[PDB]
Amino acid sequence: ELGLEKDDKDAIEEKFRERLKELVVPKHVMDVVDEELSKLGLLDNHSSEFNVTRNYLDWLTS
Amino acid sequence: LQEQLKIIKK
């Protein structure tokens, strides 16, 4: 039921993507970043693996 | 909107 009321997917996804704009990212990590965003977009936000993916993406974009 | 009547109950 909660899925029909709120969704924070787009905000965090765009927050990740905006960091990519200024960076000349190599392909061998561009594909990894893209696939991790894809995985995060289909994963429940309360799972531990979701937080692991989020932290890994934050470190990648840092 | 209408689903809130059951969401709040849950």
UniProtKB/Swiss-Prot annotation, chain A:
Tissue expression, per UniProt?
A: Duodenum, heart, lung and liver, but not thymus.
Q: Where in the cell is it found?
A: Mitochondrion matrix
Query: Which disease does the UniProt record connect it to?
Result: CODAS syndrome: A rare syndrome characterized by the combination of cerebral, ocular, dental, auricular, and skeletal features. These include developmental delay, craniofacial anomalies, cataracts, ptosis, median nasal groove, delayed tooth eruption, hearing loss, short stature, delayed epiphyseal ossification, metaphyseal hip dysplasia, and vertebral coronal clefts.
Domains (record comment):
The Lon N-terminal domains are crucial for the overall structure of the protein, maintaining it in a conformation allowing its proper functioning. The AP-domain (ATP-binding and proteolytic domains) has a closed-ring conformation in the presence of AMP-PNP and its N-terminal entry gate appears closed. Upon ADP binding, it switches to a lock-washer conformation and its N-terminal gate opens.
The similarity annotation says:
Belongs to the peptidase S16 family.
Quaternary structure and interacting proteins, as annotated: Homohexamer. Organized in a ring with a central cavity. The ATP-binding and proteolytic domains (AP-domain) form a hexameric chamber, while the N-terminal domain is arranged as a trimer of dimers. DNA and RNA binding is stimulated by substrate and inhibited by ATP binding. Interacts with TWNK and mitochondrial DNA polymerase subunit POLG.
Record function comment = ATP-dependent serine protease that mediates the selective degradation of misfolded, unassembled or oxidatively damaged polypeptides as well as certain short-lived regulatory proteins in the mitochondrial matrix. Endogenous substrates include mitochondrial steroidogenic acute regulatory (StAR) protein, DELE1, helicase Twinkle (TWNK) and the large ribosomal subunit protein MRPL32/bL32m. MRPL32/bL32m is protected from degradation by LONP1 when it is bound to a nucleic acid (RNA), but TWNK is not. May also have a chaperone function in the assembly of inner membrane protein complexes.
What protein am I looking at? Lon protease homolog, mitochondrial
Which species is listed as the source? Homo sapiens (Human)
Which span of the parent protein is shown here? 406 to 467 of 959
Curated annotation (Swiss-Prot), chain B:
Q: What does this protein do?
A: ATP-dependent serine protease that mediates the selective degradation of misfolded, unassembled or oxidatively damaged polypeptides as well as certain short-lived regulatory proteins in the mitochondrial matrix. Endogenous substrates include mitochondrial steroidogenic acute regulatory (StAR) protein, DELE1, helicase Twinkle (TWNK) and the large ribosomal subunit protein MRPL32/bL32m. MRPL32/bL32m is protected from degradation by LONP1 when it is bound to a nucleic acid (RNA), but TWNK is not. May also have a chaperone function in the assembly of inner membrane protein complexes.
Compartments where found: Mitochondrion matrix
Source organism per UniProt: Homo sapiens (Human)
Similarity comment: family membership: Belongs to the peptidase S16 family.
The protein's gene is named LONP1
The entry's protein name is Lon protease homolog, mitochondrial
Free-text comment on this protein's domains from its UniProt entry: The Lon N-terminal domains are crucial for the overall structure of the protein, maintaining it in a conformation allowing its proper functioning. The AP-domain (ATP-binding and proteolytic domains) has a closed-ring conformation in the presence of AMP-PNP and its N-terminal entry gate appears closed. Upon ADP binding, it switches to a lock-washer conformation and its N-terminal gate opens.
Q: How does it assemble?
A: Homohexamer. Organized in a ring with a central cavity. The ATP-binding and proteolytic domains (AP-domain) form a hexameric chamber, while the N-terminal domain is arranged as a trimer of dimers. DNA and RNA binding is stimulated by substrate and inhibited by ATP binding. Interacts with TWNK and mitochondrial DNA polymerase subunit POLG.
Q: Quote the range of the complete protein represented.
A: 396 to 405 of 959
Phylogenetic lineage: Eukaryota, Metazoa, Chordata, Craniata, Vertebrata
Look up the record and name the associated disease. CODAS syndrome: A rare syndrome characterized by the combination of cerebral, ocular, dental, auricular, and skeletal features. These include developmental delay, craniofacial anomalies, cataracts, ptosis, median nasal groove, delayed tooth eruption, hearing loss, short stature, delayed epiphyseal ossification, metaphyseal hip dysplasia, and vertebral coronal clefts.
- Tissues where the protein occurs: Duodenum, heart, lung and liver, but not thymus.
Q: Which branch of life, at top level?
A: Eukaryota
